[PDB]
RNA sequence: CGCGGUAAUUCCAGCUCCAAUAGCGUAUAUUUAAGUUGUUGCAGUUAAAAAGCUCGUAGUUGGACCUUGGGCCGGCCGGCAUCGCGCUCCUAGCCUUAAUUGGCCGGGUCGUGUUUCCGGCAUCGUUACUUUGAAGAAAUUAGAGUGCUCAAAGCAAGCCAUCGCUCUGGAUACAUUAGCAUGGGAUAACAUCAUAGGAUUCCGGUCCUAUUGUGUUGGCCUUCGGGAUCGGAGUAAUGAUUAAUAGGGACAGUCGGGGGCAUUCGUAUUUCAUAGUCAGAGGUGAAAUUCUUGGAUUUAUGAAAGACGAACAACUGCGAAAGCAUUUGCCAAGGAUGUUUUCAUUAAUCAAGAACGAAAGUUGGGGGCUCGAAGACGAUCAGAUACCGUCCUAGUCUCAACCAUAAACGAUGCCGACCAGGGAUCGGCGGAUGUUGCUUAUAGGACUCCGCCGGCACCUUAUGAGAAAUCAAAGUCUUUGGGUUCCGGGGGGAGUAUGGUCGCAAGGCUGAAACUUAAAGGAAUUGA
RNA sequence: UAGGAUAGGGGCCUACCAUGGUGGUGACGGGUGACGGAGAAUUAGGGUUCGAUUCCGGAGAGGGAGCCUGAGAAACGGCUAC
């Protein structure tokens, strides 16, 4: 498939664990998921071992929570790519209530439910962060 | 890690074409020469070798496919009774076809040649 | 403790290297090796790979070295090895 | 859904009350409710619901390297420097030598014509998506503005010196597949340099084109620029990215109650002949039919016949599944495992289509030991056609053929990643100067181990799901959307009718509706 | 490919010529108060359903065919025939 979906899943099953990490394998379309968690910091750190010479790339994951409260308290996906549902700048539909963003892969590129919406460019939804 | 180490400390030429070359060219056996010969030479096998021009290689799936599926079929001309073997030959020939449709988008001759080639070589 | 991964990642014991497959490796690498094996018979040592596959014998003297099995291969009788490559 | 079987808040009148109110009932269609149509937004362990199984297409879906990343200033945006290709011309940014020319001048000072000089970027392999813009009927609809007096709505209107006219409007959105044009270059493809027919400053000769120069017009090109063509010589990281917790293939020692064929054995059961000998035997809860000097039953020995592989044989194996246990040989086969071997995206999963597919029935042979539908007998039974007893045909067995179905089951699609502790056992591998072994010694192998890939599963908690029972999957679907496919969408009728299709036949497969009716069904719980 | 026709390309028809075209992305066939659209109803939304209607475009005007006039009608409150 495409990962994204399983590394968001993973990691809300993993907090009720209460476990500092889960290390996985890893894409480039969930390179992007931890970059944009970092942004609005859910990780305060993120890590991306062997990539180099390996058969994969990885990266093992320190991640907030082990502290009081969780601070991603869901993450799920809402399709992944290989299909047409799209959203614009105006059609937004939303989950959380402006607490959380809607993650969103751009024209120029992935950025928060914000940065595409004041822009005034669609795209299409990869999950949802409450 | 590892790939660097096999590079460095290996050979790469010279000792390569002469000993797999060879061997390559008296009939295939690829891994035969990487369980035998003198290590450090074959150590960069992988980390440095596309393959050589040859006969064969690209057409020893397809032959084999072909060289397996002959003898099931000789003992398909045999009992009926064998209802586990007709399964497998089922199975093997629908594996047949997938070899030869990868590996007849690369180079020229094999579009039209390994159609005809099956169960006559 | 409430581990999953190690409290030191980077340096896991080799036996949870051993866990995980050649390809899963944290640092992969063939756990296979290189070995020189001595042979009386000959005055220099021959280099072979760990798993035989093939009944490799020695190159002057044909004393034998090793048989294979589905693993790492069984040495056969008085026969001495170092474990080395380079 | 229910009420009315004589003190009916359910009827029929009256009263009183409720409650919409110039309006309200009733019917049919339709939308909601109904996530009962599941895009948003479903369910399939047990309630309706995974196809017997696998191969596998059309179709969907599909990994990573991938001129991308970083750094500076100015005020996310603009413009920069690296690793922001290029040329004809157009368009075109300022200045230097200021020169023809003009004014100065112990200055080549400055500006224009003109040489050098740069912003700013049209064309130069395809798209999808997205952006902006055009093209975009009025009405309707949303909606600007406004006292149609209100208002539904309409596009009118408000001010005057109200007897000498003043002015504002009649916006905008919607305009939905697609098409155009422009901008973006992320994400997805087509696609793409290895037999190189690649780029190129080098140059030839061949050959075409004709404007400038030429007054003009007509026949024929030199030089030359630009094409077209065929060769020689040059430059450069010259010309194939890894080797998916994706897939195949090679190879190694194995594993298995995998397959087939040949083969070998065991006792049993049946029958026969020979043997011995004297009352029961079949049978059961109790009896009898039935068999008994035509000395049974039993007993032993051979042989024949046909069947089958006890105990061993397991919360253990293998095979796609259906299924598969004596030995041995041959023949090809398959998974797991190991692998710095090879290919490099071949893959994932599927309508269609194809292969195999217990039993019974069957087509013909072999073959009929055993057992055994129907039938025929005895009890039981009002009936007993059965359980039960006794006889026994087809058949059971095997082979070539049909067939296509099963509670063909894990009632649980396939594939992938993740979320949780622990011990067995099956298989392989690794490590032990362990044990046994004694293999010359060893290595192995069986045993004990720990680690481990991939298993069949259990165990105990279950974070979590669920209606609960339960479940490491029925979790990771309300945290609602991982990929793909199939099926259900009240109960009955009805899985039938009908048609099509197929089968040798039985009959299968595909598969309604009229009409009926309010529950059918599940799990748990409490009674009896 | 050719021609005649008509305002014109045009299988439009017709000669000669070839043997094709099109389909699981559901063609071909059947059904439909099946006109199409702008739009309507009702749905938070998404949708579902509807479109006979003073508008917009076409068809028909008892059913069918054929034709005159005229810029233009295969007219129907014209004709001509059945």
């Keep these: ?25 890893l894409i480039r379309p969930s ?64 989950p959380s209530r402006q607490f959380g963003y809607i993650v969103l892969t751009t024209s120029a590129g992935i950025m928060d439910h914000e940065e595409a919406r004041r822009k005034n460019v669609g795209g299409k939804v990869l999950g949802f962060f409450y | 890690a590892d790939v660097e180490e096999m590079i460095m400390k290996a050979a790469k030429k010279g000792q390569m074409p002469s000993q797999i070359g060879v061997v390559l ?20 096998l992988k980390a440095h070798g596309l393959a050589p021009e040859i006969p064969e290689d690209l057409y020893f799936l397809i032959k084999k496919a072909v060289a397996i599926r002959k003898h099931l079929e000789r003992n398909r001309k045999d009992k009926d009774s064998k209802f586990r073997l007709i399964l497998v030959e089922s199975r093997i020939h629908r594996l047949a076809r997938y070899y030869k449709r990868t590996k007849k988008l690369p180079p020229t001759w094999k579009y039209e040649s390994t159609t005809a080639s099956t169960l006559v070589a | 403790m409430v581990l999953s991964n190690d409290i030191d990642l980077l340096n896991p014991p080799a036996e949870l290297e051993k866990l995980k497959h050649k390809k899963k490796r944290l640092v992969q690498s063939p756990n296979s090796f290189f070995m020189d094996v001595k ?30 099995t589905g693993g790492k291969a069984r040495l056969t009788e008085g026969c001495s090895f170092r474990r080395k490559g380079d």
Excluded at chain 1, 82 to 92: D, F, L, P
Excluded at chain 3, 45 to 52: E, K, R
Aim: glycine share 8%; with cysteine.
């Design chain 1, 31 to 94: 390179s992007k998921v931890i970059i944009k968690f970092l942004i609005v910091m859910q990780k305060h750190g993120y890590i991306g071992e062997f990539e180099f010479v390996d058969d994969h790339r990885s990266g093992k994951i320190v991640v907030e929570l082990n502290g009081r409260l969780n601070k991603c308290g869901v993450i799920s996906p809402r399709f992944d790519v290989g299909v047409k549902e799209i959203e614009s700048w105006t059609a937004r539909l939303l």
């Design chain 3, 39 to 68: 042979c009386q018979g000959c005055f220099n040592i021959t280099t072979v790979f760990s798993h035989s596959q093939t009944v490799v014998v020695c190159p002057g003297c044909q004393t034998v070295l090793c048989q294979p």
């Design chain 1, 1 to 25: 498939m495409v990962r994204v979906s399983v590394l968001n899943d993973a990691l809300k099953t993993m907090y009720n664990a209460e476990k500092r990490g889960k290390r996985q394998v």
């Design chain 2, 25 to 44: 060219r008296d009939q295939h056996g690829i891994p035969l020469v990487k369980s035998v010969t003198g290590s450090k030479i074959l150590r960069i």
